[PDB]
Amino acid sequence: DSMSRVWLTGDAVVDLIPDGQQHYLKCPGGAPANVAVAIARLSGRSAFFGRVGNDPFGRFMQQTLTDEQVDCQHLHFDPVHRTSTVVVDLDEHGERSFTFMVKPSADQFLQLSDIPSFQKGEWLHVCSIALANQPSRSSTFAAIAQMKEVGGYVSFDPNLREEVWSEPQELQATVMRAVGLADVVKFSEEELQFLTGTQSIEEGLQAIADFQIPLVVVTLGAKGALVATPNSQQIVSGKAVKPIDTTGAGDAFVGGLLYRLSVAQDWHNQATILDAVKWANGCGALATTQKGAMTALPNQAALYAFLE
Amino acid sequence: DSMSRVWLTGDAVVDLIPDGQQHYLKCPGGAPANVAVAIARLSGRSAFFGRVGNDPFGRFMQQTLTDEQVDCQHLHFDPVHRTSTVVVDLDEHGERSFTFMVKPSADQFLQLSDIPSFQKGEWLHVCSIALANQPSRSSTFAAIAQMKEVGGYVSFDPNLREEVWSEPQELQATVMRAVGLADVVKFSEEELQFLTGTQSIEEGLQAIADFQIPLVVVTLGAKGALVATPNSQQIVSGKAVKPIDTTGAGDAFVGGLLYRLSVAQDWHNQATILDAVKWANGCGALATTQKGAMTALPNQAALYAFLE
Numbered sequence: 074d075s076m077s078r079v080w081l082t083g084d085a086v087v088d089l090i091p092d093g094q095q096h097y098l099k100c101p102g103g104a105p106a107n108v109a110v111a112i113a114r115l116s117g118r119s120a121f122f123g124r125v126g127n128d129p130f131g132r133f134m135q136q137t138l139t140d141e142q143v144d145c146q147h148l149h150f151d152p153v154h155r156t157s158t159v160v161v162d163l164d165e166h167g168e169r170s171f172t173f174m175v176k177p178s179a180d181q182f183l184q185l186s187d188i189p190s191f192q193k194g195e196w197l198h199v200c201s202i203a204l205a206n207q208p209s210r211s212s213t214f215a216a217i218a219q220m221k222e223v224g225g226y227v228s229f230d231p232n233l234r235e236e237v238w239s240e241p242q243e244l245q246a247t248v249m250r251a252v253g254l255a256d257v258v259k260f261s262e263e264e265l266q267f268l269t270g271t272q273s274i275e276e277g278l279q280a281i282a283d284f285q286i287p288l289v290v291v292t293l294g295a296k297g298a299l300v301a302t303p304n305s306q307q308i309v310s311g312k313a314v315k316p317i318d319t320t321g322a323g324d325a326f327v328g329g330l331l332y333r334l335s336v337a338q339d340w341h342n343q344a345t346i347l348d349a350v351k352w353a354n355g356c357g358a359l360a361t362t363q364k365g366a367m368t369a370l371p372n373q374a375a376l377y378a379f380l381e
Numbered sequence: 382d383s384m385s386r387v388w389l390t391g392d393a394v395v396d397l398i399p400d401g402q403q404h405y406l407k408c409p410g411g412a413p414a415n416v417a418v419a420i421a422r423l424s425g426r427s428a429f430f431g432r433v434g435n436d437p438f439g440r441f442m443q444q445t446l447t448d449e450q451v452d453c454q455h456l457h458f459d460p461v462h463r464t465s466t467v468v469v470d471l472d473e474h475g476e477r478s479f480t481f482m483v484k485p486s487a488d489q490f491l492q493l494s495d496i497p498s499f500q501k502g503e504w505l506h507v508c509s510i511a512l513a514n515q516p517s518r519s520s521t522f523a524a525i526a527q528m529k530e531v532g533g534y535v536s537f538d539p540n541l542r543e544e545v546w547s548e549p550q551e552l553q554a555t556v557m558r559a560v561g562l563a564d565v566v567k568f569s570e571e572e573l574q575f576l577t578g579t580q581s582i583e584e585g586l587q588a589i590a591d592f593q594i595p596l597v598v599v600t601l602g603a604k605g606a607l608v609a610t611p612n613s614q615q616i617v618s619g620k621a622v623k624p625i626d627t628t629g630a631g632d633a634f635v636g637g638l639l640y641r642l643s644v645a646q647d648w649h650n651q652a653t654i655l656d657a658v659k660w661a662n663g664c665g666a667l668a669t670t671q672k673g674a675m676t677a678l679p680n681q682a683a684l685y686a687f688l689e
């Protein structure tokens with residue numbers, strides 16, 4: 074009867090998304106907060122640690138995460154900096170669809186004292202916005218080092234948003250430094266190419282071979298996901314969906330993947346990994362059926378019915 | 382056939398205002414931008430100078446102001462800082478209803494080179510957000526000094542929003558320094574008390590007697606406006622309105638007042654001033670009939686029909 078805690082950390086944000094005509098839906102969001110909810114909706118055991126602003130948006134994000142049964146014991150309210158606020162342009166997708174209105178937001182002031190005690194077998198999942206500026210960058214690296222030290226596991230997803238970085242020249246090396254630390258890494262096909270200075274996927278994975286990463290997942294959008302384990306790769310694909318809102322789809326993917334690994338006897342098992350990537354594909358498809366990153370994050374009942 | 386230019390300067394902002402249920406209307410706003418439109422709707426000759434962000438909100442504000450026939454020749458796009466973004470809480474009114482999401486926003490980086498050439502007889506109108514931080518504070522003071530030097534006139538409205546100031550201990554003296562420079566000053570009854578460390582209005586005006594201000598207008602909400610000229614005061618009141626949205630009502634007041642003084646043979650004439658405060662009251666009432674600071678700013682046809 075296995076179920077380990079999965080810690081999520083980084084930016085919780087309010088997503089302003091076009092609706093009425095000149096109206097905005099006010100949607101809960103922020104990539105690591107999206108994953109935290111995703112895991113919880115699947116009956117996972119997720120917990121968030123980090124900083125939001127001491128403002129209504131921050132409180133809306135707090136209440137949102139606890140409403141969703143995500144542990145917020147270690148979610149702090151920064152006394153001066155504002156909660157992240159992003160405007161979405163639906164004509165674009167992924168990184169190119171976001172406009173960040175608060176730089177630096179409260180999360181970029183994550184301090185060492187905000188890290189909770191890690192235990193053996195627990196998971197930690199991280200995105201690159203957490204590495205964008207100080208003190209969050211160095212705080213986040215310290216937390217990764219502490220999780221590995223204790224016998225836990227590290228999940229990383231670049232999830233790139235360049236305009237957040239005050240020194241964008243530092244993105245490549247900083248992101249690749251975290252890749253070098255994780256047990257599990259997930260790229261989009263574009264991010265992998267971009268980050269390894271390569272064209273094609275095969276050359277991408279080449280550039281990181283020396284890292285001995287236990288599991289690299291490269292999502293192919295239409296064609297599913299490529300699953301790279303030591304000395305083997307294969308494509309795992311499921312059903313497709315004409316998407317209504319692609320926002321946070323990649324996070325739902327990460328949600329399913331981490332829910333399944335977190336309840337596994339042994340996450341390194343290949344049958345286990347393949348199954349996990351099958352849940353991850355279903356989640357990512359379903360998540361696109363309603364506006365808002367979190368709105369359509371599936372419970373197990375929905376997911377199984379979609380996969381069958 | 383008189384009509385002088387009225388320069389407005391400071392913050393242009395996008396006001397997020399509750400609507401649907403968890404929707405936000407996206408409304409043009411920002412106090413000095415509200416006054417600029419107000420003057421133009423009355424067929425005035427208004428012009429805005431200052432900085433917005435090089436982002437969609439900034440461009441939305443630019444297009445808004447030129448659509449409204451306000452001269453934006455001297456409206457600059459800051460290369461790094463974001464456009465001001467404010468969340469409105471309709472349960473409160475005035476200052477207490479605003480949450481500022483961008484601090485410091487692009488306008489707080491107003492530089493000396495952004496000031497346009499002033500001419501004799503022109504007007505300049507200023508709010509305290511323009512004095513909140515540097516370099517805008519010192520830039521704004523320099524522009525006031527330059528307008529007086531050339532033979533033009535200065536309008537000031539505290540229009541207080543405390544959370545914008547990085548050093549809020551500096552608000553009182555900085556605001557009062559600008560009061561000491563203006564030909565025309567308008568307070569709310571609350572701001573006057575607050576700013577002169579007094580209770581009642583009579584004691585308030587006492588504290589500023591030494592300034593020899595040509596015209597002080599104190600708006601009484603329900604009871605109209607108190608008009609203080611050298612050695613005389615009187616209340617000017619008009620019809621009342623159950624307000625739907627009080628947002629920017631004070632700015633519409635300032636709009637009418639400055640439109641009328643700007644087209645006058647001699648703004649110092651008492652009949653002229655009294656008439657101006659009558660237009661100002663009508664504007665402030667009408668402005669509250671629709672959500673959004675700028676939405677219900679009246680044209681002359683509307684205003685006269687309301688006043689008759």
Ligand SMILES: OC[C@H]1O[C@](O)(CO)[C@@H](O)[C@@H]1O
Pocket residue numbers: 084086088101102103104105107159171202232234320321322323324366
């Ligand atoms: O992946 C989706 C999430 O990524 C962000 O752009 C930054 O965290 C959020 O605004 C959005 O919800």
Ligand SMILES: OC[C@H]1O[C@](O)(CO)[C@@H](O)[C@@H]1O
Pocket residue numbers: 392394396409410411412413415467479510540542628629630631632674
């Ligand atoms: O007076 C109304 C205006 O004042 C502000 O709070 C700050 O400039 C704006 O958000 C609003 O439109």
Ligand code: NA
Pocket residue numbers: 318319320321322360361362363364365366367368369
């Ligand atoms: Na979605």
Ligand code: NA
Pocket residue numbers: 626627628629630668669670671672673674675676677
């Ligand atoms: Na209004």
